[PDB]
Write a protein that binds this ligand. Structure first.
Ligand SMILES: Oc1cccc(-c2cccc(N3CCOCC3)n2)c1
Length: 863
C-alpha cells in the first residue's frame, strides 16, 4: 500500500536511519523484535483511539500537579473556545476546576440569554495557547500553572473546551485504516585468527578472554600465546575455562580483549553464550571489535557495524552435544530449586544476620551466613534481596536454581529497591523481569523523573526484545509526554554506533503506535535541521564581520519562506505543552561564546504574555551532563517540596537532540550576575560601592514593599543552589554562569563540571550574595543564620533520599559521561551526603564545612 510506503519513509527520516538498513542485516533477532513490537504498539494505538474524552485528555495532556498535590483570593480569566469574549471572575485557590466551570457557564447563560444544555462535567479547561489542561478533583492551587501564576502575580487565562472538541482531537490524530545440566566438561573455545589488526611491529599480540555474569568473573581469565604483530594474526588454539558447561548461567557473556606487549590496548569484543531463543551458541563467530580508549564486561554484546575498518577476531564455539541445547525452562529451574534444607540456627546468629541485612561489602563468613539464612531473607527481610543476590554463586547451576526458586515467590519491592536492581551488578533476566514488575506501580510523574536513567539501562541489555523495552514502549504509548521524551532520549544518540540499531528499532515501533505524534516529531526535526544550518552560517560569519552584521544576515536567512515555515508552529522539544508559534525574527540573536549558540524568540497571540518563550540552540557541545545536572536539581526541588520546603528553584529545560546538539530553555527577565556587577552608568542600579549593585538592581526591578519578597526569593534560591552545588560537586562557578531573575530568584547555568572533576569541591559562600541576604546591612545575624537554617534543612532532606541519588547515579554509569565513568565519581556523592554517618554527625560535618566557607568568604569581607 502507498500509505504504508509513506509512513516507512517518514519513520526513516524521523529516526535518521533507513528502515531498509534493518532488513539488510538479515538478523532473525531484529526481525522478531520488529514484528512483536509493531504488533504490541499497534494494539496500544487501537486501545487509545477508543479512550473516553477524559481518558484521552489524560493521555494527551497529563496533569501538571505540584509535588505536594500528588483560603486565598484568586482572579481568573476564562473564555469559551474561539470566541474572543472572556470573563474575569474571583474564585478561591482551594476551589475545584468544576466550580470554576459552573461559574463560567452561568455567565455565558446570562450574556447569551439562554438556559444551557451543557453541565460543567461536559468541559475541560485549556491553559491559553498551551497543550495543558486543568481537570480532575484537585484544588486550583495544586496545579503547576495556577501555582506559577500565584507566585509571579499574573492572572490565569483559561479556555473552556467541550467534550466534542477533544473527541474531534482524538479522531483527527488517529492511525491510518488497516540437556544443559548433564554437560560437566569444562567450557572451552578455539581462538582461530584476527583480521585488519593495527599495532607496532616490534610487539606481540595477546588475546585475553574472560567469562562474566555482569561485573563478576565466573572463573579465572585465560590468555592465548603471544603471536608476532601483523595484519592477520593466527592462533588456532584452544582456550579452556575453569567452569563446566552445566554451570554457565543464562546471562553469561564471553568477553575478549586484544592487545600488544613488548600493555598496548588495541580492541575489545563481547558476546552472549546463549542467543535470544535460549540456545547455547555453536560454530564460527566473527567478532567485529571495538577499538580501546582491559576486559570490558559492561560493553555491548553486538559487533562493530563498521566491518570495513574494525579488527575482527574469529572464534569457534564447540558443539558440546549432537542436538541443539537450550537453557532449561523455569519449570525445570523451580523443580531443582524447590529442594534445599531450611536454615535453623540460634538467636546469636539471628542478631548477627539482622546486623548485616540492615547494614557495602561483606566477609566470607558474613556471605555464607546470608546464603544459609536465605529463606529468612525472603520471609523476614524482603528488602535485602539485592544483598542476597550479590552473595549467590552465579557460577553454580544448583545455587542459581535455589536463588531463582525464592525469587519467583518474592514479594514485590518498593520503587527504590527496584531501581537498585536495574544496575549492571544484577544481570539475570529473571531478576531484571522482577525489577520491572516492582516498577509497574511507578506513577507517570515518577517514571518521567527516572526516564533518563531507564533509557541508559537499555545500553546494559543483552537482547533487543526485553521486558524494559516493552515497559517503556507501553508507558510511552499511554502518555504523550512520556512518548515525547522517550523518543528524544533515543534520537539524541542515533550517532552512536553501539546503540543506533537498538534505539532505531525502539523508535520505529513507537511510530507504529502513534502515526500522528511521528508527524508532530518530524515538524520538530525540520526546525532542528534549519537551526543547524542557521547556526553553521553564524559560526562562519562571526569570524568575518561585526555582530550587527551577522545578526542582520541571520535575520535575512530566517525571513526566507523555508525558514519561516520550518521554525514556526511546533511543539517545543524542551516541553510538548509549550507551543512555539510565531518566530520573532527581530528578537533572535546568537551568543558570543565558542559555539555561538542561537537565541530564538517566539510569540503567540492565543497564549498572550505566556506565549513569549525563548529557546537556545547549541551545537558543538555534549549537553548530556548538563541535562543530568538539571534533572538532579529538579529532583532536589521535588524532594524539598514533598517536605513543605519551597527553595524557589529554576529547573529550566535542557535537552540533547542530536550529535553534540541540543536546546536550552530561556528564563526570560533574568540577567547574569557578571552583567549586573559590570555596574554601568546612566542606569537605576548604578552603585557607589560594587557590593551595592545586585541589591540596587533588585530594588529597581522590585520597588516599595515588593523588595522584601525579592530578598526572600534570593535567600531561598541561594540556599537551594548552595546545597545543590555542594552535594553535586558543581565547580567552575563564577558571576557569568550564575543568573538572577527579576523576582530575585538565583539560578545556575552551563554545568560544564560536577562530582568534583578529581578535587573535593568545598562549600561556597560569596560576600556579594551575603550582602543581599543580610538586606545590605554589615551585620544581620538574624537574616544570615535564617539562611544557614534553610541550607541545613535542604541538606538533611537530601540525605534521607541519599539512596535514591546513589541508585540513579549508578544507572547513569551506563551513559558514558567522562565525569561519571567509575566508583571514584560516586564516592563524591557518598562523601557529600555523608551516608556512612548519623544525622547529628553529618550535620556537624556540614556546619564545619559551611563555617569553613564563611571563613573563606570573610577574606573578601576584610577589604
Ligand atoms: O545548561 C546550560 C548549558 C549551556 C549553556 C547554558 C546557557 C548559557 C547562556 C544562557 C543560558 N540561559 C538559559 C536559561 O535562561 C537564561 C539564559 N543558558 C545553559
Amino acid at each position: 500500500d502507498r500509505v504504508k510506503k509513506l509512513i516507512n519513509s517518514q519513520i526513516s527520516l524521523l529516526i535518521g536511519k533507513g528502515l531498509h538498513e534493518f532488513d539488510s542485516l538479515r538478523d532473525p533477532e531484529v526481525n522478531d523484535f520488529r514484528t512483536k513490537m509493531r504488533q504490541f504498539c499497534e494494539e496500544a494505538a487501537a486501545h487509545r483511539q477508543q479512550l473516553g474524552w477524559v481518558e484521552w485528555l489524560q493521555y494527551s495532556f497529563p496533569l501538571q500537579l505540584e509535588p505536594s498535590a500528588r483560603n486565598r483570593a484568586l482572579l481568573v480569566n476564562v473564555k469559551f473556545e474561539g470566541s474572543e469574549e472572556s470573563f474575569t471572575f474571583q474564585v478561591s485557590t482551594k476551589d475545584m476546576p468544576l466550580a470554576l466551570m459552573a461559574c463560567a457557564l452561568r455567565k455565558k447563560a446570562t450574556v447569551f440569554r439562554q438556559p444551557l444544555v451543557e453541565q460543567p462535567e461536559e468541559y475541560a479547561l485549556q491553559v491559553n495557547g498551551r497543550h495543558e489542561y486543568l481537570y480532575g478533583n484537585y484544588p486550583l492551587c495544586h496545579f503547576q500553572y495556577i501555582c506559577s501564576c500565584l507566585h509571579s502575580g499574573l492572572t490565569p487565562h483559561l479556555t473552556m473546551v467541550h467534550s466534542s472538541s477533544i473527541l474531534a482531537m482524538r479522531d483527527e490524530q488517529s492511525n491510518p485504516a488497516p540437556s544443559l545440566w548433564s554437560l560437566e566438561q569444562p567450557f572451552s573455545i578455539e581462538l582461530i585468527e584476527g583480521r585488519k589488526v593495527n599495532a607496532d611491529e616490534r610487539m606481540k599480540l595477546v588475546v585475553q578472554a574472560g567469562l562474566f555474569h555482569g561485573n563478576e568473573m565466573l572463573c579465572k581469565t585465560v590468555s592465548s600465546s603471544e603471536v608476532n604483530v601483523c595484519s592477520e594474526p593466527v592462533w588456532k588454539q584452544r582456550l579452556e575455562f575453569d567452569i563446566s558447561v552445566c554451570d554457565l548461567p543464562r546471562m553469561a557473556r564471553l568477553c575478549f580483549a586484544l592487545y600488544a606487549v613488548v600493555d598496548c590496548p588495541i580492541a575489545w569484543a563481547n558476546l552472549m553464550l546463549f542467543d535470544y531463543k535460549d540456545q547455547l551458541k555453536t560454530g564460527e563467530r566473527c567478532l567485529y571489535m571495538w577499538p580501546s580508549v582491559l576486559l570490558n564486561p559492561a560493553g555491548t554484546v553486538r559487533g562493530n557495524p563498521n566491518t570495513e575498518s574494525a579488527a575482527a577476531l574469529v572464534i569457534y564455539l564447540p558443539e558440546v552435544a549432537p542436538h541443539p541445547v537450550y537453557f532449561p525452562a523455569l519449570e525445570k529451574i523451580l523443580e531443582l530449586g524447590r529442594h534445599g534444607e531450611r536454615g535453623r540456627i540460634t538467636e546469636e546468629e539471628q542478631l548477627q544476620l539482622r546486623e548485616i541485612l540492615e547494614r557495602g561489602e561483606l566477609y566470607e563468613h558474613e556471605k555464607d551466613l546470608v546464603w544459609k539464612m536465605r529463606h529468612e531473607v525472603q520471609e523476614h527481610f524482603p528488602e535485602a534481596l539485592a544483598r542476597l543476590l550479590l552473595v549467590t554463586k552465579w557460577n553454580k547451576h544448583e545455587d542459581v536454581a535455589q536463588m531463582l526458586y525464592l525469587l519467583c515467590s518474592w514479594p514485590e519491592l518498593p520503587v527504590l529497591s527496584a531501581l537498585e536492581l536495574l544496575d549492571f551488578s544484577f544481570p539475570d533476566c529473571y531478576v531484571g523481569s522482577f525489577a520491572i514488575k516492582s516498577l509497574r506501580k511507578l506513577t507517570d510523574d515518577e517514571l518521567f523523573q527516572y526516564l533518563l536513567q531507564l533509557v541508559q539501562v537499555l545500553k546494559y541489555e543483552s537482547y533487543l526484545d526485553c521486558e524494559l523495552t516493552k515497559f517503556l514502549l507501553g508507558r510511552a504509548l499511554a502518555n504523550r509526554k512520556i512518548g515525547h521524551f522517550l523518543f528524544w532520549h533515543l534520537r539524541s544518540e542515533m550517532h552512536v554506533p553501539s546503540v543506533a540499531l537498538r534505539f532505531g528499532l525502539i523508535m520505529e515501533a513507537y511510530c507504529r503506535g502513534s502515526t500522528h505524534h511521528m508527524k508532530v516529531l518530524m515538524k520538530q526535526g525540520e526546525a532542528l535541521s534549519k537551526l543547524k544550518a542557521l547556526n553553521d552560517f553564524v559560526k562562519v560569519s562571526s569570524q568575518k564581520t561585526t555582530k550587527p552584521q551577522t545578526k542582520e544576515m541571520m535575520h535575512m536567512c530566517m525571513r526566507q519562506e523555508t525558514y519561516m515555515e520550518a521554525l514556526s508552529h511546533l511543539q517545543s522539544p524542551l516541553d510538548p505543552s509549550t507551543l512555539l508559534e510565531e518566530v520573532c525574527v527581530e528578537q533572535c540573536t546568537f551568543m558570543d561564546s565558542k559555539m555561538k549558540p542561537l537565541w530564538i524568540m517566539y510569540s503567540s497571540e492565543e497564549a498572550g504574555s505566556a506565549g513569549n518563550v525563548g529557546i537556545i540552540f547549541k551545537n558543538g557541545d555534549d549537553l548530556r551532563q548538563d541535562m543530568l545536572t538539571l534533572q538532579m536539581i529538579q529532583l532536589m526541588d521535588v524532594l524539598w517540596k514533598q517536605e513543605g520546603l519551597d527553595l524557589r528553584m529554576t529547573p529550566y529545560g535542557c535537552l540533547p537532540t542530536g550529535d553534540r546538539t541540543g536546546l536550552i530553555e530561556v528564563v526570560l527577565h533574568s540577567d547574569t550576575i557578571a552583567n549586573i556587577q559590570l555596574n554601568k552608568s546612566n542606569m537605576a542600579a548604578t552603585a557607589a560601592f560594587n557590593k551595592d549593585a545586585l541589591l540596587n538592581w533588585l530594588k529597581s526591578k522590585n520597588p516599595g514593599e515588593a523588595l522584601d519578597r525579592a530578598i526572600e526569593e534570593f535567600t531561598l534560591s541561594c540556599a537551594g543552589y548552595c546545597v545543590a552545588t555542594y552535594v553535586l560537586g558543581i565547580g567552575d562557578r563564577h558571576s557569568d554562569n550564575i543568573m538572577i531573575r527579576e523576582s530575585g530568584q538565583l539560578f545556575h547555568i552551563d554545568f560544564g563540571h560536577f562530582l568534583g572533576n578529581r578535587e573535593r569541591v568545598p562549600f561556597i559562600l560569596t560576600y556579594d550574595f551575603v550582602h543581599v541576604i543580610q538586606q545590605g546591612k554589615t551585620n544581620n545575624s538574624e537574616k544570615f543564620e535564617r539562611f544557614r537554617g534553610y541550607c541545613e534543612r535542604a541538606y538533611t532532606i537530601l540525605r534521607r533520599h541519599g539512596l535514591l541519588f546513589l541508585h540513579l547515579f549508578a544507572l547513569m554509569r551506563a551513559a558514558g559521561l567522562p565525569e561519571l565513568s567509575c566508583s571514584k565519581d560516586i564516592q563524591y556523592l557518598k562523601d557529600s551526603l555523608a551516608l556512612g554517618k548519623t544525622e547529628e554527625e553529618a550535620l556537624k560535618h556540614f556546619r564545619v564545612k559551611f563555617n569553613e566557607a564563611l571563613r573563606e568568604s570573610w577574606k573578601t569581607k576584610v577589604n
